[PDB]
């Protein structure tokens, strides 16, 4: 039943915007409706990778690139869970696919300590933001909803479980990590027979 076709569309077309090399704004710019698209729908999403654990909130590794030129990710929050203030180090498209999410952007002082760089946006089903590193690498993401599980859909720069990255204290501590994935085994979503 699932729409895994669809899945299998968005990541195609990726690959084929990609493919004529654009600059990052371009890439970000056209790949917004496709992606935007993609989540318009609930209808496609593994159950598999849409689970919540009850501790911290969970990363799917739905499907890499040959070259990694981009990661899609399924981002599924458990009820009231939150990251710390962290960035990426490459561009970055979120999708909203069910629930809802706050997104603030943070930028440093001198002094290298991140407060709020705008108004905190709030992230609705078939929604898409943008980040990297030129307009913006930096922000704190939240599940908009204290009982519920939202799940946004991730595309990266990259194949962002092996990304060397950072989160930061309110009081500027930097701490190195890789986010890695929640998932050992990816779904299939290639055997078309079985649809
Ligand atoms: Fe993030």
């Not at 990609?18 to 593994?46: C, F, G, I, N, Y």
């Not at 002082?109 to 946006?121: I, N, V």
């Not at 913006?136 to 990259?158: K, L, W």
Request: hydrophobic residues 35%.
């Amino acid at each position: 039943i699932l729409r895994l076709d669809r899945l299998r569309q968005f990541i195609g077309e990726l690959a084929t915007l990609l493919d004529s090399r654009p600059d990052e704004s371009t890439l970000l710019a056209q790949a917004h409706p496709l992606l935007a698209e993609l989540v318009h729908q609930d209808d496609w999403l593994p159950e598999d990778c849409a689970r919540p654990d009850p501790q911290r909130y969970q990363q799917y590794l739905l499907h890499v690139d040959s070259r990694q030129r981009f990661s899609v990710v399924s981002f599924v929050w458990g009820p009231g869970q939150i990251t710390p203030v962290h960035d990426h180090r490459v561009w970055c498209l979120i999708g909203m696919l069910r629930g809802a999410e706050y997104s603030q952007p943070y930028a440093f002082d001198a002094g290298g300590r991140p407060h709020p760089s705008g108004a905190r946006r709030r992230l609705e089903p078939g929604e898409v933001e943008a980040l990297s590193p030129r307009i913006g690498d930096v922000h704190q993401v939240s599940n908009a909803f204290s009982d519920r599980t939202s799940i946004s859909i991730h595309v990266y720069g990259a194949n962002i479980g092996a990304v060397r990255r950072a989160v930061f204290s309110a009081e500027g501590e930097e701490k190195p990590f890789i986010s890695g994935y929640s998932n050992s085994r990816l779904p299939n979503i290639w055997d078309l027979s079985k649809e």
